[PDB]
Design an enzyme around this catalytic site. Structure first.
Site, PDB file in Angstrom:
ATOM      1  N   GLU A 186      16.926  -8.057   4.535  1.00  0.00           N
ATOM      2  CA  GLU A 186      17.355  -9.388   4.114  1.00  0.00           C
ATOM      3  C   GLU A 186      16.415  -9.914   3.031  1.00  0.00           C
ATOM      4  O   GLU A 186      15.201  -9.677   3.080  1.00  0.00           O
ATOM      5  CB  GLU A 186      17.409 -10.345   5.326  1.00  0.00           C
ATOM      6  CG  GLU A 186      17.271 -11.856   5.006  1.00  0.00           C
ATOM      7  CD  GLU A 186      17.139 -12.727   6.247  1.00  0.00           C
ATOM      8  OE1 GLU A 186      17.289 -13.962   6.128  1.00  0.00           O
ATOM      9  OE2 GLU A 186      16.866 -12.198   7.341  1.00  0.00           O
ATOM     10  N   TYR A 187      16.976 -10.642   2.068  1.00  0.00           N
ATOM     11  CA  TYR A 187      16.199 -11.214   0.955  1.00  0.00           C
ATOM     12  C   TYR A 187      15.805 -12.636   1.315  1.00  0.00           C
ATOM     13  O   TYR A 187      16.651 -13.462   1.638  1.00  0.00           O
ATOM     14  CB  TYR A 187      17.015 -11.134  -0.341  1.00  0.00           C
ATOM     15  CG  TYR A 187      16.518 -11.948  -1.521  1.00  0.00           C
ATOM     16  CD1 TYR A 187      15.210 -11.879  -1.940  1.00  0.00           C
ATOM     17  CD2 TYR A 187      17.390 -12.768  -2.243  1.00  0.00           C
ATOM     18  CE1 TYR A 187      14.762 -12.618  -3.028  1.00  0.00           C
ATOM     19  CE2 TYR A 187      16.954 -13.506  -3.315  1.00  0.00           C
ATOM     20  CZ  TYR A 187      15.629 -13.429  -3.711  1.00  0.00           C
ATOM     21  OH  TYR A 187      15.183 -14.166  -4.810  1.00  0.00           O
ATOM     22  N   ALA A 188      14.500 -12.890   1.313  1.00  0.00           N
ATOM     23  CA  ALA A 188      13.926 -14.211   1.533  1.00  0.00           C
ATOM     24  C   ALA A 188      13.584 -14.799   0.168  1.00  0.00           C
ATOM     25  O   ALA A 188      12.582 -14.413  -0.427  1.00  0.00           O
ATOM     26  CB  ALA A 188      12.669 -14.087   2.384  1.00  0.00           C
ATOM     27  N   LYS A 243      12.844  -1.932   0.425  1.00  0.00           N
ATOM     28  CA  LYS A 243      11.460  -1.503   0.535  1.00  0.00           C
ATOM     29  C   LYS A 243      11.435   0.001   0.372  1.00  0.00           C
ATOM     30  O   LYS A 243      12.143   0.715   1.087  1.00  0.00           O
ATOM     31  CB  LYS A 243      10.854  -1.905   1.880  1.00  0.00           C
ATOM     32  CG  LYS A 243       9.373  -1.512   2.031  1.00  0.00           C
ATOM     33  CD  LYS A 243       8.638  -2.439   2.999  1.00  0.00           C
ATOM     34  CE  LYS A 243       7.119  -2.291   2.869  1.00  0.00           C
ATOM     35  NZ  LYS A 243       6.412  -3.312   3.682  1.00  0.00           N
ATOM     36  N   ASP A 257       6.692  -8.740   9.258  1.00  0.00           N
ATOM     37  CA  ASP A 257       6.010  -7.581   9.839  1.00  0.00           C
ATOM     38  C   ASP A 257       6.754  -7.165  11.096  1.00  0.00           C
ATOM     39  O   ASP A 257       7.181  -8.021  11.892  1.00  0.00           O
ATOM     40  CB  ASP A 257       4.530  -7.839  10.126  1.00  0.00           C
ATOM     41  CG  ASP A 257       4.297  -9.024  11.047  1.00  0.00           C
ATOM     42  OD1 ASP A 257       3.926 -10.106  10.536  1.00  0.00           O
ATOM     43  OD2 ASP A 257       4.469  -8.878  12.275  1.00  0.00           O
ATOM     44  N   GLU A 291       0.859 -13.187   4.687  1.00  0.00           N
ATOM     45  CA  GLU A 291       1.420 -12.294   3.649  1.00  0.00           C
ATOM     46  C   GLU A 291       2.747 -11.679   4.085  1.00  0.00           C
ATOM     47  O   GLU A 291       3.515 -11.246   3.234  1.00  0.00           O
ATOM     48  CB  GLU A 291       0.456 -11.172   3.193  1.00  0.00           C
ATOM     49  CG  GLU A 291      -0.773 -10.893   4.073  1.00  0.00           C
ATOM     50  CD  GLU A 291      -1.827 -11.994   3.956  1.00  0.00           C
ATOM     51  OE1 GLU A 291      -2.127 -12.653   4.976  1.00  0.00           O
ATOM     52  OE2 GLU A 291      -2.326 -12.222   2.832  1.00  0.00           O
ATOM     53  N   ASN A 292       3.019 -11.652   5.393  1.00  0.00           N
ATOM     54  CA  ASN A 292       4.277 -11.117   5.918  1.00  0.00           C
ATOM     55  C   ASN A 292       5.118 -12.162   6.595  1.00  0.00           C
ATOM     56  O   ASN A 292       6.004 -11.835   7.382  1.00  0.00           O
ATOM     57  CB  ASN A 292       4.000  -9.963   6.885  1.00  0.00           C
ATOM     58  CG  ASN A 292       3.294  -8.804   6.200  1.00  0.00           C
ATOM     59  OD1 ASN A 292       3.564  -8.510   5.035  1.00  0.00           O
ATOM     60  ND2 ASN A 292       2.381  -8.161   6.904  1.00  0.00           N
ATOM     61  N   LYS A 297       0.826  -1.204   0.000  1.00  0.00           N
ATOM     62  CA  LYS A 297       0.000   0.000   0.000  1.00  0.00           C
ATOM     63  C   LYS A 297       0.866   1.262   0.000  1.00  0.00           C
ATOM     64  O   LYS A 297       0.641   2.177  -0.799  1.00  0.00           O
ATOM     65  CB  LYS A 297      -0.924  -0.005   1.222  1.00  0.00           C
ATOM     66  CG  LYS A 297      -1.866   1.193   1.315  1.00  0.00           C
ATOM     67  CD  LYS A 297      -2.650   1.165   2.611  1.00  0.00           C
ATOM     68  CE  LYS A 297      -3.265   2.516   2.914  1.00  0.00           C
ATOM     69  NZ  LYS A 297      -4.172   2.437   4.088  1.00  0.00           N
ATOM     70  N   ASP A 340       0.147  -7.936  14.584  1.00  0.00           N
ATOM     71  CA  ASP A 340      -0.510  -8.776  13.625  1.00  0.00           C
ATOM     72  C   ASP A 340       0.559  -9.657  13.045  1.00  0.00           C
ATOM     73  O   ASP A 340       1.629  -9.162  12.692  1.00  0.00           O
ATOM     74  CB  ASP A 340      -1.091  -7.887  12.510  1.00  0.00           C
ATOM     75  CG  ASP A 340      -2.544  -8.172  12.223  1.00  0.00           C
ATOM     76  OD1 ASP A 340      -3.196  -8.826  13.061  1.00  0.00           O
ATOM     77  OD2 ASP A 340      -3.043  -7.718  11.168  1.00  0.00           O
TER      78      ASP A 340
HETATM   79  O1  LIG Z   1       2.787  -9.517   1.010  1.00  0.00           O
HETATM   80  C1  LIG Z   1       2.925 -10.003  -0.102  1.00  0.00           C
HETATM   81  N1  LIG Z   1       4.119 -10.053  -0.693  1.00  0.00           N
HETATM   82  C2  LIG Z   1       5.270  -9.621  -0.099  1.00  0.00           C
HETATM   83  C3  LIG Z   1       6.359  -9.495  -0.947  1.00  0.00           C
HETATM   84  C4  LIG Z   1       7.563  -8.989  -0.496  1.00  0.00           C
HETATM   85  C5  LIG Z   1       7.732  -8.590   0.830  1.00  0.00           C
HETATM   86  N2  LIG Z   1       8.983  -8.300   1.262  1.00  0.00           N
HETATM   87  C6  LIG Z   1      10.018  -9.118   0.987  1.00  0.00           C
HETATM   88  N3  LIG Z   1       9.901 -10.215   0.248  1.00  0.00           N
HETATM   89  C7  LIG Z   1      11.051 -10.954  -0.183  1.00  0.00           C
HETATM   90  N4  LIG Z   1      11.056 -12.218  -0.950  1.00  0.00           N
HETATM   91  C8  LIG Z   1      10.084 -12.610  -1.807  1.00  0.00           C
HETATM   92  C9  LIG Z   1      10.472 -13.428  -2.866  1.00  0.00           C
HETATM   93  C10 LIG Z   1       9.546 -13.826  -3.830  1.00  0.00           C
HETATM   94  C11 LIG Z   1       8.224 -13.397  -3.767  1.00  0.00           C
HETATM   95  O2  LIG Z   1       7.343 -13.768  -4.692  1.00  0.00           O
HETATM   96  C12 LIG Z   1       7.832 -12.566  -2.730  1.00  0.00           C
HETATM   97  C13 LIG Z   1       8.758 -12.177  -1.765  1.00  0.00           C
HETATM   98  N5  LIG Z   1      12.229 -10.690   0.602  1.00  0.00           N
HETATM   99  C14 LIG Z   1      12.283  -9.603   1.348  1.00  0.00           C
HETATM  100  C15 LIG Z   1      11.196  -8.848   1.556  1.00  0.00           C
HETATM  101  F1  LIG Z   1      11.325  -7.816   2.364  1.00  0.00           F
HETATM  102  C16 LIG Z   1       6.664  -8.750   1.712  1.00  0.00           C
HETATM  103  C17 LIG Z   1       5.433  -9.238   1.247  1.00  0.00           C
HETATM  104  C18 LIG Z   1       1.689 -10.587  -0.742  1.00  0.00           C
HETATM  105  C19 LIG Z   1       0.460 -10.063  -0.320  1.00  0.00           C
HETATM  106  C20 LIG Z   1      -0.735 -10.547  -0.838  1.00  0.00           C
HETATM  107  C21 LIG Z   1      -0.711 -11.570  -1.781  1.00  0.00           C
HETATM  108  C22 LIG Z   1       0.503 -12.107  -2.201  1.00  0.00           C
HETATM  109  C23 LIG Z   1       1.716 -11.631  -1.688  1.00  0.00           C
HETATM  110 CL1  LIG Z   1       3.238 -12.403  -2.319  1.00  0.00          CL
END
Ligand SMILES: O=C(Nc1ccc(Nc2nc(Nc3ccc(O)cc3)ncc2F)cc1)c1ccccc1Cl
Ligand SMILES: O=C(Nc1ccc(Nc2nc(Nc3ccc(O)cc3)ncc2F)cc1)c1ccccc1Cl
Lengths: 250, 250
Positions: free
Chosen positions: B86-88, B37, B149, B135-136, B18, B131
């Site tokens: 950090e990258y997940a 981010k 989160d 998604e987090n 958002k 929370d």
């Molecule tokens: O929250 C969502 N995505 C999301 C994506 C990135 C972040 N932050 C980071 N993510 C990632 N890795 C990641 C790799 C592949 C993906 O497809 C998604 C993430 N690493 C670090 C983050 F800070 C936090 C959240 C989300 C929300 C609603 C539906 C689907 C998704 Cl994938």
């Protein structure tokens, strides 16, 4: 209609605070006299209180009472925040108290009545105050008390709930009233000390005494207000009805 | 050593939130892969959550746990805020759950263990979470759960203390665990509904049921967690010792 600094002529400094000064000012177009509080963003941000201010400004803008200092509006530029305030011509109660040393029972009763009324109006809108100090109690042109510290939601003025890290309430205003009532009558607040550590203990133990000149009626009111248990403190309605208040207030 | 945007090569968007997106990024000098981010100040400020973020960033910087996503640092320019994360690599648990529909008892037990451990470490530093949503919840390269989160101090994931306007506690994490544990096993959270008004009532009455495939052991854990009274919820220590957890976790 938005504002900017060029809309105002700035006069002498009324007070030099920590986060900035408040000046006498006159709106150029209308000639409306007022007070302009000038704050620096970088300082607010470094102290971490910018949001605390935005909330307080949001609350104040809503509050209309003859004993609450009006916030007319606000604005900002690259580096400063500006609050446009009602001008209280007769200065702080703090200064009044220094000049007089202490107040008689009728001036005190009158001020507590004015505070209780203001707080009563605030309570009905679910607003409280962290702290009510004499340095932020101002005087209108007729000598009417005006609360200048903004609403929420040195330790001298803080209740035990807050300093002990307990859960605070609407009842902090009742403690505030007891502290002020005492300070008005004796000329210094009841938990005054040379150190913070000692002022803390004293607030926490509710450890104070009265000079001999403080009458029974005032002792009774002050003691009912300065209860450790917030639930044991009276409602504002009852302060306005206390016989020492009704016998002495205007 | 301070950062700026020119220090990083930006890759594809990992998620569009958002308040801004998170991107894959590589620090130019070291070739260190990470997540960036990107937030917009004006949006944060208009929503009134900039300070809430500064606090959350302050807390996160302190937290080192293999199941908490690291915050390496942060910076800003004229209009944006940047968090260096950090990258997940394996993405969100939410996506994993959509692909699988639901998780078996060993994957779930394992994730709850990882969460309990992370929260247990957080509890010892007096940190909670508002929370915890799927998604987090992110996945490391070996499939290890990572809480994304940030810490404090749709309604689906909020405990009754919070939604009812009651006094919340360290115990909100225990509710979170019960919500997630259920969602992991059945593939949607226990108070799901088509409206907020109805989801609220359901959380407040603790009104949910179990599909028939949810075993006795899981029912027992989930029910102990989803108590209306936070004091009735177990300690994290006890979740890690629950026989259904020990029998099924890695
Ligand atoms: O929250 C969502 N995505 C999301 C994506 C990135 C972040 N932050 C980071 N993510 C990632 N890795 C990641 C790799 C592949 C993906 O497809 C998604 C993430 N690493 C670090 C983050 F800070 C936090 C959240 C989300 C929300 C609603 C539906 C689907 C998704 Cl994938
Ligand atoms: O808090 C102090 N001063 C103070 C001054 C101005 C403001 N703000 C406003 N004041 C004034 N009036 C005023 C007039 C004459 C005075 O000498 C002082 C004030 N009106 C509006 C304000 F917003 C708030 C507080 C103070 C603090 C410690 C010692 C002495 C003092 Cl006078």
């Amino acid at each position: 209609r938005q504002w900017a600094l060029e809309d105002f002529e700035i006069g002498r400094p009324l007070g030099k605070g920590k986060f900035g000064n408040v000046y006498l000012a006159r709106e150029k177009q209308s000639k409306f006299i007022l007070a302009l509080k000038v704050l620096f963003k970088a300082q607010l941000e470094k102290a971490g209180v910018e949001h605390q201010l935005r909330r307080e400004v949001e609350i104040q803008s809503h509050l209309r009472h003859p004993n609450i200092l009006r916030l007319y509006g606000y604005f900002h530029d690259a580096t400063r925040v500006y609050l446009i305030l009602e001008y209280a011509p007769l200065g702080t109660v703090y200064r009044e108290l220094q000049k007089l040393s202490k107040f008689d029972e009728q001036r005190t009763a009158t001020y507590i009545t004015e505070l209780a009324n203001a707080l009563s109006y605030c309570h009905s809108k679910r607003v409280i105050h962290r702290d009510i100090k004499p340095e932020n109690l101002l005087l209108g042109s007729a000598g009417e008390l005006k609360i200048a510290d903004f609403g929420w939601s040195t330790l001298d003025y803080l209740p035990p709930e807050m300093i002990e890290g307990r859960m605070h309430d609407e009842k902090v205003d009742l403690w505030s009233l007891g502290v002020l009532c005492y300070e008005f009558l004796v000329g210094k607040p009841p938990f005054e000390a040379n150190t913070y550590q000692e002022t803390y203990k004293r607030i926490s133990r509710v450890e104070f005494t009265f000079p001999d000149f403080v009458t029974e009626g005032a002792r009774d009111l002050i003691s009912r207000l300065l209860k450790h248990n917030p639930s044991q403190r009276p409602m504002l309605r009852e302060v306005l009805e206390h016989p020492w208040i009704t016998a002495n207030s205007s």
